[PDB]
């Protein structure tokens, strides 16, 4: 106030005054010294028009009051800093003056929500807990205008749920089964949790492919035909954890999916530009080291299951001849390269632990024809990558490895129908032809993850054409139907075979077909416009038979 015998500005100061507590005490020369420092520090609070020093009933003063020519500078200055500091106990609470009435107690708590691993638990838990007996979970496109959930209950494969128009194009499983990726034409949706609900949704449209990172943190969405949400980036990569568009990239026409390929651990993501291979690094998804891999003419590439190696291959040019390169990451070094010279085509076939890379190599005379196909195998456990040089033979059209092993099977075209050659490991080592069989319709070699059993399948043939062989010493177990055969899969432990006839592929019969690893048909189920079937990724028997016994008697 304006009275001489004033007192402290008791609660919540007015328009123009700043009040500070814990000021330097009264005494010899100290008062003008305090003003002399105040007129350096407080000059950004406005030009001082009054500075006040009353003594409340004559007491020594813990306070001073400052008033300014334009006080909205003081409003800037208390927002510039607070807790202004001079020697020892002198730390200043800068304000118009304290409100003081309230109490800081009471502001309370939080409720945590459920999270992404909820159906990762509902995979391993689901597998043991269920009463049936005994096998895999799907993942069905086709029953009828519905997207559907089934189990292998052996008696029949029985539907758990069938949900009306749930996917509108395609459906894909997460690597550990943690999520299901579903397309709705208002945005891609990630369906997770125990009873299946939408945890995230991603705004891209025109999509057909919807594929995951191996560690399940990022989703890759691809539109072959443009919309308005691509604008104009066909390949869009979404961060699952944060929900946002992390990267977009322009279209790839070349050639057969996957055209974007991940490392086995999900650390590195990669695509070919014809004169440059681009590597993107998890979790950020920016360019690796701020560098690319400079390679010209790259046809295809395939990652090792082992840490951490890319196999890639480069065709002939008018200067450099054709080559296969093994390149190690994160080193970025070509660690074993072989020029192949004069090749029509090559195919890169890894063994499932990364122990071997087989290259199937078609070689060319000057008349420009596939005169001979070779097999050359890189050995990756052994000292300094040895090479097993194996075959010379006429027109090889397919090759496939034994799961977690070393045996393999081979198909030769043009004879007039397709001819089969079976390979086993020698007593001294090297892998060599050991048994053959007469000509057949099989174009596709698909092995059981259990190791013994191989399927020789005549895909895209109206009839037969599924033939089943037990290995070692290659014995034909069975030959069975699948009318207009298209799609094929096994259980991860090799217990069941499931084959499909997709309505994308063939519009004759449309069905799924289920067969037991002992050479016995279980059931076939025909469905009108069947689009796809995908399995979910993945002492006792007498007790289980006792449990089964109790179910139906007494």
The CATH number of whichever domain residue 35 belongs to comes to 3.30.70.330
Tell me if 322 sits within 8 A of 339, measured CB to CB: yes
**Cα–Cα distance measured from residue 438 to residue 459, given in angstroms and rounded to the nearest whole number:** 18
Query: By the 8 A CB rule, do 326 and 302 touch?
Result: no
Terminal-to-terminal C-alpha distance of the chain: 99
Any idea how long the chain is? 554
Same domain, 452 and 526: yes
d(CA 90, CA 438): 99
Residues 214, 128: one domain? no
Identify the experimental approach.
Answer: cryo-EM
Report the relative pairing of strands 63-68 and 48-52 from DSSP bridges: antiparallel
Domain end, chosen from 235, 257, 279, is at: 257
DSSP SS3 for 424:
strand
Give the C-alpha separation, 450 to 326, whole Å: 28
Report yes or no on 409 lying in a domain.
no
In a shared domain, residues 129 and 226: no
**CA distances (Å), origin 419, targets 334, 415, 435, 471:** 37, 7, 12, 17
Within-domain flag for 152: yes
Cis omega (within 30 of 0) for bond into 416: yes
Residues 534 and 442 in one domain: yes
C-alpha–C-alpha distance, residues 536 and 124, integer Å: 12
Residues 210 and 224 in one domain: yes
d(CA 472, CA 426): 12
- Where a domain ends, among 203, 225, 257? 257
Q: Report angle CA 342, 347, 348 to the nearest 5 degrees.
A: 120
Beta bridge partners, 346, equal 361
Q: Which of 243, 253, 248, 242 is nearest to 221 (CA)?
A: 248
Q: Per the domain annotation, does 363 fall within a domain?
A: no
Q: Give the C-alpha separation, 469 to 11, whole Å.
A: 93
Task: Please tell me whether residue 444 adopts helix, strand or coil conformation.
Answer: strand
Helix (H) or strand (E) holding 191, with range, is strand 187-192
Angstrom distances, CA of residue 148 to CA of 187, 352, 415: 20, 30, 43
Domain-located, residue 403: no
Reference 434, options 446, 425, 447; nearest CA is 425
**Residues in a beta bridge with 20:** 64
What φ, ψ does residue 78 adopt, rounded to 5°? -75, -15
Q: How many domains, in total, are found in the chain?
A: 3
**Is the distance from CB of 272 to CB of 280 less than 8 angstroms?**
no
Residue whose tokens read 């259980």: 491
Task: Tell me if 482 sits within 8 A of 499, measured CB to CB.
Answer: yes
Range of the domain at 88: 17-92
C-alpha–C-alpha distance, residues 193 and 436, integer Å: 49
Q: 178 and 148 share a domain?
A: no
- Residue 436 shares a structural domain with residue 527: yes
Are 128 and 46 within 8 A, CB to CB?
no
The token pair at 75 is 């409003």
Residue 58 lies in a domain: yes
Is 184 in the same domain as 152? no
Asked if 183 and 194 count as a contact pair (C-beta separation under 8 A), the reply is no
In a domain, 200, yes or no: yes
Same domain, 199 and 175: yes
**Region of residue 230 (phi > 0: left; psi between -120 and 50: alpha; otherwise: beta):** alpha
Residues 6+ apart with CB under 8 A from 414: 394, 395
* Short-list 537, 485, 472, 480, CA closest to 512: 485
Q: Same structural domain for residues 124 and 155?
A: yes
- What is the dihedral angle through the alpha carbons of 336, 297, 246, 177, rounded to the nearest 10 degrees? -60
- Pair 470, 503 in one domain: yes
**146 and 203 both lie in a single domain:** no
Residue 428 DSSP code: T
Torsion of CA 112, 218, 352, 389, to 10 degrees: -160
Contact 343, 363 (CB under 8 A): yes
Residue 18 and residue 78 in contact, taking contact as beta carbons nearer than 8 Å:
yes
Instruction: Tell me whether residue 354 is in a domain.
Output: no
Answer whether 44's CB lies under 8 Å from 68's CB. Answer: no
Q: What CA–CA distance (Å, rounded) separates 15 from 58?
A: 27
Identify the sign of the CA torsion 436, 438, 439, 441: negative
311 burial (CB, 10 Å; 0-12 / 13-18 / 19+) is: buried
Query: Sheet harboring 261-262: ordered strands across?
Result: 261-262, 268-273, 276-281, 286-287
231 is a domain residue? yes
Rounded to whole angstroms, the Cα distance separating 543 from 554 reads 17
Round to whole Å and give the CA distance between 495 and 233. Answer: 42
Cα–Cα dist 459/466, whole Å: 9
Nearest to 200 by CA among 234, 209, 282, 212: 212
């Amino acid at each position: 106030g304006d009275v001489l015998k004033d007192r402290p500005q008791e609660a919540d100061g007015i328009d123009s005054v700043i009040v500070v507590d814990n000021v330097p005490q009264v005494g010899p020369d100290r008062l003008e010294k305090l003003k002399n420092v105040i007129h350096k520090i407080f000059s950004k609070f406005g030009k001082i028009t009054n500075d006040f020093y009353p003594e409340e009933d004559g007491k020594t003063k813990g306070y001073i009051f400052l008033e300014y020519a334009s006080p909205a500078h003081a409003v800037d200055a208390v927002k510039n800093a607070d807790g202004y500091k001079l020697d020892k106990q002198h730390t200043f609470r800068v304000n118009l003056f304290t409100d003081f009435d309230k109490y800081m107690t009471i502001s309370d708590e939080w409720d945590i929500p459920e999270k992404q691993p909820f159906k990762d638990l509902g995979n391993l838990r689901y597998w043991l807990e269920e009463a049936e007996c005994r096998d895999q979970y799907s993942v069905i496109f086709e029953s009828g205008d519905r997207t559907s959930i089934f189990w292998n209950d052996v008696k029949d494969p029985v539907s758990i749920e069938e949900r009306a128009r749930w996917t509108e194009t395609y459906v894909r499983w997460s690597p550990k089964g943690t999520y299901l990726a579903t397309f709705h034409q208002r945005g891609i949706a990630l369906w997770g949790g125990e009873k299946f609900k939408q945890i995230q949704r991603f705004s891209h449209q025109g999509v057909q492919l919807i594929d995951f990172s191996p560690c399940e943190r990022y989703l890759v969405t691809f539109s072959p035909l443009m919309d308005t949400q691509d604008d104009p980036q066909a390949i869009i990569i979404w961060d699952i954890l944060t929900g946002h568009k992390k990267r977009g990239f322009h279209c790839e026409s070349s050639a057969h999916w996957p055209i974007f390929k991940w490392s086995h651990d999900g650390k590195f993501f990669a695509r070919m530009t014809l004169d440059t291979l681009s590597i993107y690094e998890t979790p950020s998804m920016g360019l690796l080291d701020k560098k690319s891999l400079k390679i010209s003419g790259i046809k295809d590439f395939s990652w090792s299951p082992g840490g951490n190696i890319i196999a890639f291959w480069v065709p002939e040019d008018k200067d450099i001849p054709a080559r296969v390169t093994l390149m190690q990451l994160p080193s970025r070094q070509e660690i074993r390269v072989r020029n192949l010279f004069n090749v029509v085509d090559c195919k890169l076939h890894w063994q499932k632990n990364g122990d071997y890379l087989c290259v199937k190599v078609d070689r060319t005379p000057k008349g420009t024809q596939g005169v001979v196909t070779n097999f050359e195998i890189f050995r990756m456990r052994e000292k300094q990558v040895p090479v097993d040089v194996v075959e010379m033979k006429e027109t090889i059209i397919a090759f496939a490895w034994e799961p977690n092993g070393s045996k393999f099977a081979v198909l030769h075209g043009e004879a007039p129908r397709i001819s089969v050659s079976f390979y086993h490991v020698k007593s001294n080592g090297k892998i060599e032809l050991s048994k053959m069989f007469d000509k057949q319709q099989a174009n596709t070699i698909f092995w059981s993850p259990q190791g013994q059993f191989v399927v020789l399948a005549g895909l895209r043939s109206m009839n037969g054409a599924l033939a089943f062989v037990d290995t070692s010493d290659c014995t034909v177990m069975n030959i069975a139907e699948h009318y207009m055969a298209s799609d094929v899969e096994w259980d991860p432990t090799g217990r069941y075979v499931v084959t499909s006839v997709s309505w994308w592929s063939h519009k004759v019969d449309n069905a799924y077909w289920l067969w037991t690893f002992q050479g016995r048909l279980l059931q076939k189920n025909n469905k009108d416009r069947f689009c796809q079937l995908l399995w979910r990724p993945r002492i006792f028997e007498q007790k289980d038979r006792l449990s089964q016994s109790k179910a139906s008697k007494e």
